[PDB]
């Protein structure tokens, strides 16, 4: 069921672009709307930013193939390179309705699109990064993820990760034969 | 600059000898811990330690009977080189 990796990587790329739209990491003047999941989405048209997102999900896809990823996380960092909010895609993995699962992903997009309602404003000058939490610490994980030259990965320190006393804002959970995933946000207690 | 407790270098050289010499199949977790130790030396601007750590490990790991320690060394260095290539524009000599 490595279709899941192909489906998830498509979805995560779309969800990362939308997350940076909705949280204002980047100017409105680089987004353009496009249709995924027969819901609209708002994707970047900046090449360097698009390359960073595609480079990242190119390296993750094979860890997804073996169900070796517990979480893919989009981290909003503050100007001090400190996490301020985290969008966590928590992942658990033939009556096969692959066609119906892709459309269950639309509800993620609509929840993401309206999530500034239920979240505090971020400090100005935020950037982001991507964390991949593996199910187990395995040599094979890092062998698979270092395939793009000029795009190496490292093991994150507690600084790349740690938020004191965060709040948890659940957004959407799905429960299928082939894809068990939920999206929740962790926001920093304060600014 | 942590390696599983040891800040002082000579202590690191000592945690790494006990580990490589007495244990014939290392857990992947500990190999990853040495890679993170090495990439942290890069962030913290200690290329001399980095060089000395690689040299110490290359001796001990390549001298092992157990072929696992040989492939663990290749793995460690591979993940250090790709960090150096980007952070410094270059590759560590041996």
């Amino acid at each position: 069921g490595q279709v899941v990796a192909d489906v998830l990587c498509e979805f995560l790329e779309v969800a990362v672009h939308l997350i940076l739209y909705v949280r204002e990491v980047y100017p409105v003047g680089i987004f353009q709307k496009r249709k995924k999941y027969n819901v609209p989405v708002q994707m970047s048209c900046h090449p360097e930013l698009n390359q960073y997102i595609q480079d990242t999900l190119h390296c993750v896809k094979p860890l997804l193939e073996k169900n070796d990823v517990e979480k893919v996380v989009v981290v909003i960092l503050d100007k001090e390179h400190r996490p301020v909010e985290k969008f966590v895609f928590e992942i658990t993995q033939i009556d096969s309705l692959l066609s119906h699962v892709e459309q269950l992903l639309a509800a993620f997009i609509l929840k993401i699109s309206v999530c500034d309602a239920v979240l505090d404003h971020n400090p100005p000058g935020c950037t982001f990064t991507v964390l991949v939490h593996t199910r187990e610490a395995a040599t094979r994980n890092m062998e698979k993820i270092q395939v793009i030259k000029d795009f190496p990965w490292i093991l994150a320190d507690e600084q790349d990760v740690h938020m004191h006393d965060p709040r948890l804002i659940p957004l959407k959970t799905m429960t299928s034969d082939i894809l068990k995933m939920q999206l929740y946000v962790e926001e920093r207690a304060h600014k | 600059g942590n390696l599983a407790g040891a800040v002082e270098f000579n202590d690191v050289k000592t945690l790494l000898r006990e580990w490589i010499t007495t244990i014939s199949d290392p857990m992947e977790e500990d190999i990853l811990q040495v890679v993170k130790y090495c990439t942290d030396l890069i962030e913290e601007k200690d290329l001399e330690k980095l060089d000395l750590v690689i040299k110490y490990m290359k001796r001990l790991m390549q001298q092992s009977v157990e072929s696992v320690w040989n492939m663990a060394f290749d793995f460690i260095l591979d993940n250090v080189q790709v960090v150096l290539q980007q952070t410094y524009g270059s590759t560590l000599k041996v």
Binding site: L49, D55, T56, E70, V132, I145 | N2
Partner: peptide
């Protein structure tokens, strides 16, 4: 200090780089 968290070394382009 468990070692199961991977991240790109590289930063994405800064809000600056993009409005060139």
């Amino acid at each position: 200090r468990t070692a199961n968290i991977l991240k790109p070394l590289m930063s994405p382009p800064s809000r600056e780089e993009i409005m060139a």
